[PDB]
Design a protein around this ligand. Structure first.
Ligand code: HEM
Length: 153
């Protein structure tokens, strides 16, 4: 369970992310797709993007980065009472999108990298530790849903 002080560190940096949801989303998806190319294969609509410049130019990719960060932000602001928000997400990503838990670890690592690039003064070690704990809780709760449905990752 994160303490209240850890949730404050998380939501203090996220309020910065929300100043520019679309640029943050771009940087995070592009990092994910470059570091782990297999994840790009899950998206029929982005499969055609071959270079980082093509990814940066894609309005559809930018739009989907806003979708992802908007849903994550809604979960974070629930501070670990996020059952209603998480359940629809785990069901679609297990049974429709077929995303293994491992890929949620990958995108977590991209999120933490981008936050540290863009917000050094609000993302020192103590915030980085709280954010890693929040994303682990996110993954742990999804993985429980996966297990129930027969997908565990
Ligand atoms: C922070 C983690 C993630 C969040 C909050 C998230 C959220 C979302 C949301 C809100 C949607 C649209 C509604 C829905 O289909 O349920 C979506 C769709 C999708 N997500 Fe995720 N997602 C995350 C991670 C991933 C990852 C790691 C992958 C793939 C490697 C993935 C693949 C997909 C696909 C294939 C779709 C449908 C996209 C389309 O063709 O319209 N998601 N995700």
């Amino acid at each position: 369970v994160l303490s209240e002080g850890e949730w404050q560190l998380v939501l203090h940096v996220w309020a910065k992310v929300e100043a520019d949801v679309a640029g943050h989303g771009q940087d995070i998806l592009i990092r994910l797709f470059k570091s782990h190319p297999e994840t790009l294969e899950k998206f029929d609509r982005f499969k055609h993007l071959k270079t980082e410049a093509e990814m940066k130019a894609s309005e559809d990719l930018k739009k989907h980065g806003v979708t992802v960060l908007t849903a994550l932000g809604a979960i974070l602001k629930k501070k670990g009472h996020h059952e209603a928000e998480l359940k629809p997400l785990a069901q679609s990503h297990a049974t429709k999108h077929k995303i293994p838990i491992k890929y949620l670890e990958f995108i977590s690592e991209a999120i933490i990298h981008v936050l540290h690039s863009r917000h050094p003064g609000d993302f020192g070690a103590d915030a980085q530790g709280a954010m890693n704990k929040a994303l682990e809780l996110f993954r742990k709760d999804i993985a429980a849903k996966y297990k129930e449905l027969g997908y565990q990752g």
